[PDB]
Amino acid sequence: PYTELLVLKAHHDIVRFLVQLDDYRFASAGDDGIVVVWNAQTGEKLLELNGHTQKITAIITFPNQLILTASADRTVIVWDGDTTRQVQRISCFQSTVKCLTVLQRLDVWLSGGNDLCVWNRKLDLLCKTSHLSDTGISALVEIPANCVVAAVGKELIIFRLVAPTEGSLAWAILEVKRLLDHQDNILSLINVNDLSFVTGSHVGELIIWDALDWTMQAYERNFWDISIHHFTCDEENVFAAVGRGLYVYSLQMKRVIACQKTAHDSNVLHVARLPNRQLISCSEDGSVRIWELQLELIGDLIGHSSSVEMFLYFEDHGLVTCSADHLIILWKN
């Protein structure tokens, strides 16, 4: 259980994103276009970053550590963590940036909308696709050998990024493959352990891919048999929110191993495995449940009165949840 709880108040619209900054702080971001920095130990509100005029669509940290946010205002803003100063607003987009990702090795970060742009810390545009899609990149995930996988509707497009020769400043983006095996839009794209990545669609397709040669390994047209709303992964399992139920699929056995068909009174939104090996599920109605894997309901976390959009887990500071009810709740002990 988590007994004690703190209610952290600031947002005046749906809180969608939580992102850990360091060992004790995290940021939240909402449809109110506000970003807030919180102390996870004490629950103190540390900083507010105001500068977006519409909902935030993505937020990441760039390890001094920066915070980057994209918004339906068609900008990406880059924030200085310490001073809370706005380093730059980037507004050279004709469409909403939908995803942001860091390539650690190469020490760049990517924006994904109608096009893929490659950036460095100093905020130089190094390269960008032109007219990649009208659809928009819905997910970018790093895989080995400096490649990145982009979800574009039903398609996956794999790019390799090449740093310039010392002497030149010319980066290159090479398209290296397209995968066209989904009949439905790609909802989830996840790197499992740098050997596989997995994609899912809302209709219940699950595909496992080789992260090195980019070939199909396994395929399910409907891996659980109601739509799937979200997937996550550990080293060997996929945990899917499917209707009001949870399903656990083994990547090794290519089978559903565990199941709970009515885990909640409402659609399950998010389901994930914590480091400590417990499961957390989040629902439309506001309930959060903790499980141990048959699935045993350990904990019932009751407080939110509306969709729980995301959770964040600190080993030493407990559990954070955020909700369409404008609250963040920090659960402890």
Side-chain angles (χ1 to χ4, degrees), residues 1-3 5-63 65-73 75-81 83 85-88 90-120 123-129 132-165 167 170-176 178-187 189-225 227 229 231-250 253 256-260 262-276 278-279 281-283 285-291 293 295 297 299-314 316-332:
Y2 296 82
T3 57
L5 77 76
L6 298 158
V7 174
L8 330 186
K9 279 169 168 285
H11 289 279
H12 62 90
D13 200 345
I14 297 176
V15 200
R16 289 194 180 290
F17 304 112
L18 296 166
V19 175
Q20 166 172 5
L21 294 191
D22 56 41
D23 60 294
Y24 73 99
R25 306 185 294 129
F26 68 93
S28 64
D31 287 358
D32 53 11
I34 305 170
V35 177
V36 182
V37 189
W38 303 92
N39 192 304
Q41 180 156 49
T42 73
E44 194 186 312
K45 180 189 191 202
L46 298 182
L47 296 168
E48 219 172 77
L49 316 161
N50 284 284
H52 278 296
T53 58
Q54 290 181 54
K55 53 191 255 276
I56 290 176
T57 49
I59 175 170
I60 56 164
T61 57
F62 184 88
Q65 183 184 70
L66 305 186
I67 304 170
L68 299 78
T69 58
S71 175
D73 66 19
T75 70
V76 168
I77 301 185
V78 181
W79 305 95
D80 181 302
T83 61
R85 199 191 76 254
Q86 175 170 326
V87 172
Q88 201 166 117
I90 314 173
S91 53
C92 61
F93 306 101
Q94 304 215 307
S95 56
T96 288
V97 174
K98 291 284 193 228
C99 36
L100 302 163
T101 201
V102 181
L103 308 175
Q104 284 82 25
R105 174 145 61 171
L106 287 170
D107 184 53
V108 293
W109 61 277
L110 309 182
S111 55
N114 283 344
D115 283 294
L116 181 61
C117 303
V118 183
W119 308 87
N120 70 3
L123 309 185
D124 289 310
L125 178 63
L126 301 182
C127 39
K128 65 169 301 211
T129 68
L132 185 69
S133 86
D134 295 57
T135 325
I137 302 164
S138 55
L140 287 168
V141 164
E142 185 167 8
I143 61 164
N146 286 344
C147 292
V148 62
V149 188
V152 187
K154 297 138 54 70
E155 286 186 61
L156 301 160
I157 307 171
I158 314 193
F159 304 89
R160 170 176 285 133
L161 296 204
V162 190
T165 312
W171 286 74
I173 314 173
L174 318 179
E175 175 190 302
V176 290
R178 299 207 184 219
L179 312 167
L180 294 105
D181 280 300
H182 284 275
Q183 312 310 328
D184 185 40
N185 285 333
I186 292 166
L187 170 72
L189 166 70
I190 292 160
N191 181 335
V192 184
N193 73 12
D194 284 317
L195 295 171
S196 285
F197 62 97
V198 300
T199 53
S201 67
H202 93 285
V203 293
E205 296 168 291
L206 191 158
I207 303 191
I208 307 181
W209 308 92
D210 193 290
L212 298 177
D213 73 7
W214 317 315
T215 58
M216 194 152 86
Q217 288 177 300
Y219 173 90
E220 295 282 354
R221 190 175 232 157
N222 190 304
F223 75 86
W224 62 269
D225 193 1
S227 315
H229 307 111
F231 300 169
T232 59
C233 299
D234 69 357
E235 299 275 46
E236 51 182 47
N237 282 299
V238 161
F239 315 87
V242 190
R244 319 215 315 238
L246 319 167
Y247 296 73
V248 189
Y249 179 99
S250 176
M253 297 213 327
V256 166
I257 67 171
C259 177
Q260 181 87 67
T262 44
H264 290 272
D265 291 10
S266 28
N267 290 330
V268 180
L269 297 186
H270 298 278
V271 49
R273 192 204 266 294
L274 303 162
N276 54 45
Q278 301 188 119
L279 282 75
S281 57
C282 315
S283 56
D285 70 67
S287 35
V288 176
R289 289 192 201 237
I290 313 298
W291 315 78
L293 174 63
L295 284 162
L297 173 58
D300 216 319
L301 278 56
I302 295 165
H304 287 293
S305 70
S306 209
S307 292
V308 175
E309 301 291 339
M310 206 168 163
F311 76 84
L312 191 67
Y313 168 91
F314 287 81
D316 291 313
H317 304 302
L319 179 68
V320 195
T321 60
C322 70
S323 177
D325 69 7
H326 308 337
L327 299 181
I328 305 162
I329 304 181
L330 169 51
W331 314 83
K332 284 183 194 286

